């Protein structure tokens, strides 16, 4: 199976309250492993996965430094942007960034990513070549000139094709038994009347990893793609996820309907009916 | 392992 590393940055300005807040979170696949908040008691990188706790003091010192240096830089960035858009200090503003590398079900690098946003809108993004930038508006074109002059695309390519890959591989081995082995869903079907002769058949899926899951209803052999209430995949809060798919069926006609589950941890796609 | 940057990486 494929694996990917991602870091997520949020830089929020908050004038009238004080200096901007910087939050950084690292993910391997759907597992968060590190967090860094500028507002925490003593700003340092904190472990969020068990397998990363084996990394030495040298690892946490360096991460700490790197994030502390970004604290000042994204604060600086927030002034620069407030300068390009000519924005007053009357408003709170947000810089978002996400970068990282994907690996194939083979271990080999598939591609790299580096995207940034301002006030929730695309701002600047690294291209597929890792040599150039796409700017969204003319404010980002000033950023583009700054980054070209300083050859920043170089730094990123050295990371995405280099450090990003090597470190991801290290993390994948260090915690292979939670990062490379997949948790299958715990599936069942509930029956619940909502009238005097038409009832709900809800297909539950609980305790699975990663979040990738397909839940579908079928009658006679045809997908009920129309008449299905389908919730968003939701975190259980214990490194597992949840989802269900529900359909309203005419009473005494339950056993025409079948739920279908597709998920990495399942050796084969599962078929379920309601069990009287 | 985060992306190292520093000044000149500012927006």
């Amino acid at each position: 199976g494929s694996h990917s590393m991602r870091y997520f940055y949020t830089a929020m300005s908050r004038p009238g309250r004080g200096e901007p807040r910087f939050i950084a979170v690292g993910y391997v696949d759907d597992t968060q492993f590190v967090r860094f908040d500028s507002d925490a008691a003593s700003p340092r990188t904190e472990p969020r996965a068990p397998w990363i706790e084996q990394e030495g003091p040298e690892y946490w010192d360096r991460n700490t430094q790197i994030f502390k240096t970004n604290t000042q830089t994204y604060r600086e960035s927030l002034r620069n942007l407030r300068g390009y858009y000519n924005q007053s200090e009357a408003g709170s503003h947000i810089i978002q960034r996400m970068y990282g590398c994907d690996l194939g079900p083979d271990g080999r690098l598939l591609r790299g990513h580096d995207q940034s946003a301002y006030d929730g809108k695309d701002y600047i993004a690294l291209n597929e070549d890792l040599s150039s930038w796409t700017a969204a508006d003319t404010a980002a074109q000033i950023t583009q000139r700054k980054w070209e002059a300083a050859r920043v695309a170089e730094q990123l390519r050295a990371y995405l094709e280099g450090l990003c890959v090597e470190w991801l591989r290290r993390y994948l081995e260090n915690g292979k038994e939670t990062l490379q082995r997949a948790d299958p869903p715990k599936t069942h079907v509930t029956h619940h009347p909502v009238s005097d002769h038409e009832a709900t058949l809800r297909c539950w899926a609980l305790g699975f990893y990663p979040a990738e899951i397909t839940l579908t209803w079928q009658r006679d052999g045809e997908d009920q793609t129309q008449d299905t209430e389908l919730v968003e995949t939701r975190p259980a809060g214990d490194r597992t996820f949840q989802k269900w798919a529900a359909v309203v069926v005419p009473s005494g006609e339950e056993q025409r309907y079948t739920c279908h589950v597709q998920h990495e941890g399942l050796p084969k796609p599962l078929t379920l009916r309601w069990e009287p | 392992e985060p992306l190292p940057q520093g000044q000149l990486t500012a927006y």
Partner: T-cell receptor
Amino acid sequence: DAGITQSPRHKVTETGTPVTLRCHQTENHRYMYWYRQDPGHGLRLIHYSYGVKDTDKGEVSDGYSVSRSKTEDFLLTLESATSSQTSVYFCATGTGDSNQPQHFGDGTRLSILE
Amino acid sequence: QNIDQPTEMTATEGAIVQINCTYQTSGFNGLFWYQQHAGEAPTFLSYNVLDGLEEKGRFSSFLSRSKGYSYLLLKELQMKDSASYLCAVQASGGSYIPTFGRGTSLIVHP
């Protein structure tokens, strides 16, 4: 002279004596470094700073102390100078960017005698 | 990081010298070359992070990431090229702080 000024340039002190070297910059670089150069060895890191009041140890930090009270200056103190600290000392500055060079100061010939 | 380069090399003016530098580095995030004259500060020559041969005047810089090998090739050797040549490596190991090898003394003979 790339904005970097070291003082003193030459100094001769007695062993067991406080000594301080000054590194000053005019370019606002977030990172500053103190290295030493010894025959047989290359440049070896003593201490470095990644911002005002942000400092860490290099390879040869024993007997050395540093302060980055402001951006302009990175100061190097040897509390009790030993004859082993007899060396040429280089200070450097940088933007922090992994693809940018360090800019080195002109050096300091420091001799410590019994 | 164990940066490793020859102590001393010797050539005559007009020739071509290759200065090897090998590093044992996982966490590699770039290689720097510096020219240092005796009694003077080191000055920047090249930054190398990609595999390949990079020409900048009469100086070339080579890097092979897989094998941890880099050379600096000086052509049309001149009297002023007489100097020490520094190999610097930035790694995850310490921090991405340029760590220096012992340097290579080059003597250019007239």
